[PDB]
Amino acid sequence: ETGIGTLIIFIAMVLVAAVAATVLINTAGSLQQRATSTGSQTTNQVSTGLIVQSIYGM
Amino acid sequence: ETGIGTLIIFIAMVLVAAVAATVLINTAGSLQQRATSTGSQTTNQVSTGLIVQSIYGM
Protein backbone atom coordinates (compact mmCIF):
# COMPACT_ATOMS: atom_id res chain seq x y z
CA GLU A 1 0.00 0.00 0.00
CA THR A 2 0.90 3.70 -0.36
CA GLY A 3 1.14 4.01 3.45
CA ILE A 4 4.53 2.25 3.65
CA GLY A 5 6.16 4.32 0.88
CA THR A 6 4.90 7.62 2.33
CA LEU A 7 6.62 7.03 5.69
CA ILE A 8 10.02 6.19 4.13
CA ILE A 9 10.16 9.42 2.07
CA PHE A 10 8.87 11.40 5.09
CA ILE A 11 12.02 10.52 7.08
CA ALA A 12 14.21 11.65 4.15
CA MET A 13 12.31 14.96 3.82
CA VAL A 14 12.93 15.82 7.49
CA LEU A 15 16.68 15.09 7.25
CA VAL A 16 17.09 17.25 4.11
CA ALA A 17 15.33 20.24 5.72
CA ALA A 18 17.71 20.01 8.71
CA VAL A 19 20.75 20.34 6.41
CA ALA A 20 19.58 23.63 4.83
CA ALA A 21 18.77 24.97 8.32
CA THR A 22 22.35 24.25 9.49
CA VAL A 23 23.89 26.18 6.57
CA LEU A 24 21.97 29.39 7.36
CA ILE A 25 22.85 29.32 11.08
CA ASN A 26 26.57 28.58 10.52
CA THR A 27 26.94 31.34 7.89
CA ALA A 28 25.21 33.95 10.09
CA GLY A 29 27.47 33.04 13.03
CA SER A 30 30.60 33.49 10.88
CA LEU A 31 29.47 36.89 9.55
CA GLN A 32 28.52 38.01 13.08
CA GLN A 33 32.09 38.07 14.42
CA ARG A 34 33.53 39.81 11.34
CA ALA A 35 30.93 42.62 11.36
CA THR A 36 31.37 43.21 15.12
CA SER A 37 35.19 43.38 14.92
CA THR A 38 35.17 45.70 11.87
CA GLY A 39 32.96 48.25 13.67
CA SER A 40 35.14 48.35 16.81
CA GLN A 41 38.43 48.59 14.87
CA THR A 42 37.18 51.49 12.72
CA THR A 43 35.98 53.44 15.80
CA ASN A 44 39.51 53.19 17.25
CA GLN A 45 41.04 54.07 13.86
CA VAL A 46 39.22 57.41 13.46
CA SER A 47 39.51 58.64 17.07
CA THR A 48 43.22 57.89 17.60
CA GLY A 49 45.92 60.37 16.52
CA LEU A 50 49.19 62.10 17.46
CA ILE A 51 49.89 65.85 17.58
CA VAL A 52 53.16 67.82 17.52
CA GLN A 53 53.42 70.61 20.11
CA SER A 54 56.76 72.37 19.47
CA ILE A 55 60.16 71.69 17.86
CA TYR A 56 63.47 73.00 19.25
CA GLY A 57 67.01 72.86 17.83
CA MET A 58 70.54 73.23 19.23
CA GLU B 1 4.39 16.15 2.54
CA THR B 2 5.89 19.63 2.00
CA GLY B 3 4.12 20.89 5.15
CA ILE B 4 6.58 19.18 7.53
CA GLY B 5 9.72 20.47 5.77
CA THR B 6 8.39 24.05 5.58
CA LEU B 7 7.96 24.29 9.37
CA ILE B 8 11.50 23.05 10.14
CA ILE B 9 13.19 25.65 7.89
CA PHE B 10 10.81 28.34 9.23
CA ILE B 11 12.26 27.95 12.76
CA ALA B 12 15.81 28.27 11.36
CA MET B 13 14.90 31.42 9.37
CA VAL B 14 13.59 33.17 12.52
CA LEU B 15 16.74 32.35 14.53
CA VAL B 16 19.07 33.64 11.78
CA ALA B 17 17.19 36.96 11.51
CA ALA B 18 17.56 37.47 15.29
CA VAL B 19 21.37 37.16 15.02
CA ALA B 20 21.72 39.96 12.43
CA ALA B 21 19.40 42.15 14.55
CA THR B 22 21.66 41.69 17.61
CA VAL B 23 24.79 42.81 15.70
CA LEU B 24 23.24 46.14 14.63
CA ILE B 25 22.00 47.00 18.15
CA ASN B 26 25.29 46.08 19.88
CA THR B 27 27.40 48.09 17.40
CA ALA B 28 25.18 51.19 17.70
CA GLY B 29 25.38 51.02 21.51
CA SER B 30 29.20 50.87 21.40
CA LEU B 31 29.47 53.84 19.01
CA GLN B 32 26.97 55.83 21.12
CA GLN B 33 29.26 56.17 24.16
CA ARG B 34 32.35 57.07 22.10
CA ALA B 35 30.59 59.83 20.12
CA THR B 36 29.05 61.34 23.29
CA SER B 37 32.37 61.39 25.19
CA THR B 38 34.32 62.87 22.24
CA GLY B 39 31.90 65.82 21.97
CA SER B 40 32.07 66.68 25.69
CA GLN B 41 35.88 66.38 25.88
CA THR B 42 36.41 68.66 22.86
CA THR B 43 34.08 71.34 24.30
CA ASN B 44 36.21 71.41 27.47
CA GLN B 45 39.42 71.39 25.39
CA VAL B 46 38.61 74.55 23.39
CA SER B 47 37.12 76.64 26.22
CA THR B 48 39.83 76.00 28.84
CA GLY B 49 43.03 78.09 28.94
CA LEU B 50 45.52 79.95 31.16
CA ILE B 51 46.60 83.61 30.88
CA VAL B 52 49.66 85.45 32.23
CA GLN B 53 48.92 88.80 33.91
CA SER B 54 52.31 90.29 34.86
CA ILE B 55 55.90 89.18 35.57
CA TYR B 56 58.13 90.75 38.25
CA GLY B 57 61.82 90.21 39.07
CA MET B 58 64.08 90.88 42.07
Numbering used by the authors:
A (entry chain A), B (entry chain D): 25 to 82
What are the paper's exact sentences on this?
Archaeal Type IV pilins and archaellins, which form the subunits of pili and archaella, respectively, are expressed as preproteins with a signal peptide. The pilins/archaellins are then assembled into a filament, wherein the hydrophobic alpha helical N-termini are helically stacked in the core of the filament, and the hydrophilic β-strand-rich heads are oriented towards the filament's periphery. Through single particle cryo-electron microscopy (cryoEM) and helical reconstruction, we solved the structures of these filaments at 2.61 and 2.52 Å resolution for C. divulgatum and O. meridianum, respectively. Atomic model building, bioinformatics analysis, and motility experiments suggest that the C. divulgatum fibre is a nonrotary, likely adhesive T4P, whereas the O. meridianum filament is an archaellum.
The O. meridianum archaellum filament has an unusual, barbed structure distinct from previously investigated archaella, which tend to have a rather smooth surface. The barbs are formed by a unique extended loop that is flanked by two short ⍺-helices and spans from V126 to L153. Oxyplasma meridianum ArlB boasts eight glycans (N62, N72, N91, N113, N121, N138, N150, N187), making it the most heavily glycosylated archaeal filament protein known to date. Only two of the eight glycans are bound to the spike domain, suggesting that it has not evolved to serve as a dedicated glycosylation sub-domain, as seen in the archaellum of S. acidocaldarius. In contrast, a typical hinge region for archaella consists of two residues, and the archaellum of O. meridianum follows this general trend. We observed that O. meridianum is capable of directional swimming motion, thus confirming that the archaella of this organism are indeed functional.
